[PDB]
């Protein structure tokens, strides 16, 4: 298990909490992004994720550095899955430990916003009658 990783296997979640804990930390926040079935109108069959892997892994490492700078005392771990994901599968997991609770919440929310901004990962939404790569 790397601190920052792109994987093809289902994400084993609890080991990421463990990585971030030590005696100085009193808080851990874990965020998991799951595939939703319904509603921008027509039901999602599944999601296909792909990545430019080495650079994607680097950009995740970079977000960890930004978090260390902005919130010292934190430890961050991030993993993203690729390939076809089913309804409710974990696409992404972010774990941030910290001495006190607020930094953990802040750094964790920072991470997910930065992933959506700078990491070369792309999702394709497939449904019965078609499919389309997403932007933003």
């Amino acid at each position: 298990m790397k601190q920052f990783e792109i994987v093809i296997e289902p994400i084993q979640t609890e080991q990421y909490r463990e990585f971030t804990i030590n005696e100085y930390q009193g808080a851990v926040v874990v965020f998991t992004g799951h595939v939703r079935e319904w509603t921008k109108g027509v039901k999602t069959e599944y999601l296909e994720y792909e990545a430019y892997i080495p650079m994607a892994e680097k950009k995740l490492a970079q977000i960890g550095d930004e978090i260390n700078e902005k919130w010292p005392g934190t430890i961050t771990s991030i993993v993203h899955r690729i390939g076809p994901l089913q309804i409710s599968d974990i696409a992404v997991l972010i774990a941030v430990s910290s001495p006190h609770r607020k930094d953990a919440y802040r750094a964790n929310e920072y991470a997910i916003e930065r992933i959506k901004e700078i990491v070369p990962i792309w999702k394709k939404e497939i449904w019965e009658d078609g499919s389309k790569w997403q932007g933003h």
Partner: protein
Amino acid sequence: MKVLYFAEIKDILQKAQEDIVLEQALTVQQFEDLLFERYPQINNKKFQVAVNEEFVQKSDFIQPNDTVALIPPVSGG
């Protein structure tokens, strides 16, 4: 120079990489220019370019040996 395509561009172009011989170093802008002439069918698609896994300005140079990736709007998470 190794060129890498992803997402919608990968699908339009039917391929994930190709090799393109550059006589000399080109600015990112010139390379996009070359790409649109070579591939009319993607000149309405938005992408940044990454050289050796780094984002770059349009007036930065691509060396003949560099690896260049077309990065469409990202939709991770």
